[PDB]
Symmetry: none
Subunit: 126 residues, 2 copies
């Protein structure tokens, strides 16, 4: 009954300084079974909380739906479904590229009971 969906968002991003908080990824973590909360842990290139392009350029990710603890996002949410959007901050100077985020989702109980890798790429146009 545990499922995750992680996709790049539909909004178009162009290189240059962002006027506004700009959506990049959307995440959905589901389970109707009893649980305490979730972890979203960056992996590989994306460690630190970044999306990373082919040449290695990094862009920080932010979410208003999840808390952060040193190196990963977390939330105590026992509902059947949690959603989170990861956005780029306003004022960030972003270069063109195909930026990939990799990470591992973890469901925990009042102890991790389910985990799964996520991976998505968002385009920044020139």
């Amino acid at each position: 009954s545990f499922s995750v969906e992680f996709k790049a968002t539909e909004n178009e991003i162009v290189s240059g300084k962002l006027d506004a908080d700009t959506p990049a990824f959307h995440l959905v973590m589901s389970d109707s079974g009893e649980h305490k909360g979730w972890n979203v842990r960056p992996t590989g290139a994306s460690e630190g909380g970044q999306m990373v392009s082919a040449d290695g350029t990094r862009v920080d990710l932010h979410t208003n739906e999840l808390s952060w603890d040193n190196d990963h996002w977390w939330i105590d949410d026992g509902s059947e479904r949690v959603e989170a959007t990861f956005f780029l901050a306003a004022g960030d100077e972003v270069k063109a590229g195909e930026y990939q985020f990799t990470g591992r989702v973890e469901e925990y109980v009042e102890t991790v009971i389910n985990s799964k890798d996520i991976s998505a790429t968002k385009t920044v146009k020139e």
Copy 2:
């Protein structure tokens, strides 16, 4: 803050150049808040030049960075910026050429580091 500076891989042979020829590659990166970067030639390289053991001075050029009298600079807030320094076409080149410089990150310089690399022009 990280800096990477190296000779390019293309072979250069002595004589007078036809087109523009890559000589070095530079990567300046920092995840911290910043306004831009300076690349300041130091030592024998002052003037923006690579210099061989016999004292032959060859001009460097870049289309990725701006120039201001005696140094390159760029306003770039992104986490990472790359530059290729090339020799101009029509330049006579004779050895082992060293460029020495200092990379600076500014907002006021908040990080800096010496860079050095040697490029071979063969007979």
